[PDB]
Amino acid sequence: VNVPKTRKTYCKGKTCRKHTQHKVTQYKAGKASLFAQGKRRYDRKQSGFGGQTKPVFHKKAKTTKKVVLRLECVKCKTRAQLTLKRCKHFELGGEKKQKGQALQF
Amino acid sequence: MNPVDHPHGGGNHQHIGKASTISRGAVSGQKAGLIAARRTGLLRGSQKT
Amino acid sequence: AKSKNHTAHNQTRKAHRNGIKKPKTYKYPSLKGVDPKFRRNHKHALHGTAKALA
RNA sequence: GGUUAUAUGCCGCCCGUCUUGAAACACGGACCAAGGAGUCUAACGUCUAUGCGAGUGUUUGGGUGUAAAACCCAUACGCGU
RNA sequence: GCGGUUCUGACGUGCAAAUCGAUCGUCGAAUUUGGGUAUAGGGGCGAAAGACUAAUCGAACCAUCUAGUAGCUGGUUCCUGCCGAAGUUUCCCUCAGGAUAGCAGAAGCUCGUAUCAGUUUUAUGAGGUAAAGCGAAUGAUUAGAGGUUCCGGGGUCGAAAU
RNA sequence: UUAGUGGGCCAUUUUUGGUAAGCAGAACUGGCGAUGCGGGAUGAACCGAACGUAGAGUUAAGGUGCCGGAAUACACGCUCAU
RNA sequence: AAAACAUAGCAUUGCGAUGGUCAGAAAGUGAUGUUGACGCAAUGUGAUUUCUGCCCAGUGCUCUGAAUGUCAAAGUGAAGAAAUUCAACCAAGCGCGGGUAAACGGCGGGAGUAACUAUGACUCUCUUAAGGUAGCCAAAUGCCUCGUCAUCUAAUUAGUGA
RNA sequence: AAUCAGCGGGGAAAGAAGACCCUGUUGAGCUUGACUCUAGUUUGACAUUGUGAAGAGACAUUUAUAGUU
RNA sequence: UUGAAGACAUUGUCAGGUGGGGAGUUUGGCUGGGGCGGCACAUCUGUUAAACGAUAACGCAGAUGUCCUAAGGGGGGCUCAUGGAGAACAGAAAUCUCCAGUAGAACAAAAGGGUAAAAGCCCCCUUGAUUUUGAUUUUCAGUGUGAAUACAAACCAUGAAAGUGUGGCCUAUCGAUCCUUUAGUCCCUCGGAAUUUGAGGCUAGAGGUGCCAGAAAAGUUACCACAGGGAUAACUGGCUUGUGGCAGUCAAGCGUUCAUAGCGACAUUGCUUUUUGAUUCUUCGAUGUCGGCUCUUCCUAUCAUACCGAAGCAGAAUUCGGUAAGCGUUGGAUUGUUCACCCACUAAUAGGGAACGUGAGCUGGGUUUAGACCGUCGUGAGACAGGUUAGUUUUACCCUACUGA
């Protein structure tokens, strides 16, 4: 799937509340902090004897992730997120489809 | 012997079943066979330096 | 071992013991799912009729 | 007329159990006595009775006593408002 | 003396929780054996059978934790009266089990001939099963008949010929 | 508000798999399970009919040679099987 | 009670004591050891005779082998008010590379080709390391199978030889 | 009626809550390239821990800088 | 005291590696037993399905874990499959033209439905595939998830406009709690008081659980254990009779000639329970599990013997058939065998049943516990309806039956 690098869509920002132009990127998770309370608790639980104290997932099934778009408004800089359906190939501002061309050998 | 008694024990034929060469870093109960062997098999030649 | 999978045998007999009750009707049903634009006005209309029979 | 034993006519498989289905060629039971299995507690739901009622609950404790009883009680605290 | 092959003998509620008879292996050593002594339970000891470790061994015995847990088996003690089921729904490492809804009892409460009803009638909808159809669409299928190839092919003239 | 239950099974009709099955699986109803009683010799489910204790009458389904309560009844035919 | 175990014989492995193998909760602690390679420890095979093929890709074991892959804690540097963050450095091990089958083990398939046909010494091929050598065989190892031939018998799923 | 010696057809005779098989969210003996650990062992760091040298390398193609490993 | 050794080593603490030697644990489910296989486990289309809805089976034929900035949204113009007749090279098939053409095309992907100045084809403009939360339909407990429907309040797109548009013409295309992470408010909290970092909250997403309402998980046991199961396999028995076995009917042919002496194709009706399946009703607090030996009795579908009919019956030998189960039906080699096979005798060497008769009647060769060897398989423990060798066969004195007393 191919989606354009810009998109005019609604902006929730209090100085907009109207359709504005947005830059479109893909969302990437973010580095897990060592001081997030869950990480600190896990570290305490894992210390000492007793081995692995929490489940470890093994039974992977999916071969895709949902794509999320980060839309940044070009006026106010407010951001929004949009989830696409599952897909195997994703590109952002790819070359558009030409109709009615000879498929080369 | 039976498995309870020796690493080599057991089996529906008598056989070792894993390499008989054992690491120098193996622990008591594992060091049976040829410990830390540089080579094995019939020595074709003279052993003198 | 294998067992029975499904049947509705005996289910209508069970249903008819405490009968199949028709759902019971009121003057004044809920205005629930009625168009909000209509409802919003209708409040204002009913307000005025009170302030008039007074 | 009752009771009881017997006779006669007709009828009447061995109980208990699990089970769709037991008289079963399913299981327990030779016999008899005595023992032998839904209890108490903490905290709760519905319902009912009783007291008092925007309150209610004396019993931690104190007072008293014919002494583990009965009788009396301040401040809190609990639940409710 | 030590052993324990065969009879698959006796016996098999025994003489005996391993015996008896005959037959048999070995009989100067890797021999047999008394006493002393060492090795102790995930331990010992093993010319190795998971053998032996006090009639206990693929982990002894004793006490305790311990009335260990059991979706599994068995049992569960007086009388009469009235009402009276389910084996189905959904979810569950669910399929010999639960939760859930249903069916059932009890307690009633608000009223008092309604609102009702495993029923008919009248009116008015919906339905694509039974039947039917295939000289109607799709698909299958028997037979001739007529017609046509600016072309399919066998027969034979035919320069070649729509 | 709370119990039990959450193995079902059979018959008629509709019905799938299967050569078929007292086989496996569905549909609607009635049953058995939970239920005795009269009948079908016998039998969970068929037919009749559902049950307080008694008396009398009448019947259901099934019967009336004898066993066995009830016509070796009446009537028209058919049938003789080493 | 045996064809199993042991056995002599054979072969391999480790170790020169600051040691190998093994013990202990620990120890100014132990076994081997009153020992010292013709020894102690760990394995395999199983008298003599005769022989003991090929494969180091895998798993293992092993190496004064390359290094700049991976790479802990402490330490170091930078940023920051600091908690901290980031980086560089970075032991052994892993990875990379060599050795080793009396280490665990492995030892396939197709096509063509000789002057009767047949067969294929010979040749070409595919294949994950290599492609079963010497021998031996319907063997206590062969499904098909009571294999085929011979012998043994009147007759043999038996026996023996092939 | 009451019975004696025999006998092994039957009592699906007796002996043991089937060892086979399945089920149980019941085990245990054993194995491994299962999950999770662990004695031991090995490697580094700090401590035990004091006192001296000398070279050879690294840090802001050769070759000079000052400090620090 | 004397040698060695020396700030190394040793010892202590922490860190990385190694570590079935050892410890603990796990090693789904459904299922015509279980296992192997499959997925009927989350789903979608058509049919089964009995014309409302619901509806099973490891029923039938198929599909899903995607794909798309257009293949989404709006508007415009146009018309498809196919066939016919024409046009240099050009032919069955190239491109152009006319006529016919109810969809026989296309619409991402299964199948069904839907669609013609369109929902198809081409072109133009776009981001309604957006924001805020509620209601509703399906599945249903009337929970969740998914999917979908109609509005509201905004902001937009398109179009002259009415309108249409909250992703894909409709019916599938997917995911809790905890944790992490992002967006939003730049808001609440850090509880002696402040500021700034950090952490924690509130609202909306993503990271995934396919066993799809969502454990973190490998084997073996013939050394085996326990709770149970006839809810479930391995005998008999029962239902069934495909398969096996036996018998009919028809008569095209065969039989020198001649359908039927004897046979008999294509068809087709049955019987039997001496085959083997199918099933799972009985038995898992146990009905002793192959074969032989012994012994009795029964069936007849008759091998022999008696008496007969028929013949392609001259005789002799034989063949087909009837009444017949009265009477017999064997000795051996090999194999545990059942079965088979051969030698031989014979009047004849028929077939079967009785819990696949018969183990408190035997035996124990086979099978089928524990020992052991081999081969193949397996890294291994171990497996083998493969071969091989060794492996405790218990009790009657009761009742009946029977034999005698």
Ligand SMILES: C[C@@H]1C[C@@H]([C@H](O)CC2CC(=O)NC(=O)C2)C(=O)[C@@H](C)C1
């Ligand atoms: C696989 C990863 C983790 C997983 C999840 O946090 C696992 C948890 C779930 C839970 O409630 N308790 C636990 O202890 C484990 C999740 O959400 C995924 C998207 C991302």
Ligand SMILES: [K+]
């Ligand atoms: K072994």
Ligand SMILES: [K+]
């Ligand atoms: K089941």
Ligand SMILES: [K+]
């Ligand atoms: K079922």
Ligand SMILES: [K+]
């Ligand atoms: K009397």
Ligand SMILES: [K+]
């Ligand atoms: K029972």
Ligand SMILES: [K+]
């Ligand atoms: K029994």
Ligand SMILES: [K+]
């Ligand atoms: K141990």
Ligand SMILES: [K+]
């Ligand atoms: K003892």
Ligand SMILES: [K+]
């Ligand atoms: K123990």
Ligand SMILES: [K+]
């Ligand atoms: K259960």
Ligand SMILES: [K+]
């Ligand atoms: K019609």
Ligand SMILES: [K+]
């Ligand atoms: K038609």
Ligand SMILES: [K+]
């Ligand atoms: K209930």
Ligand SMILES: [K+]
């Ligand atoms: K329930």
Ligand SMILES: [K+]
């Ligand atoms: K009844």
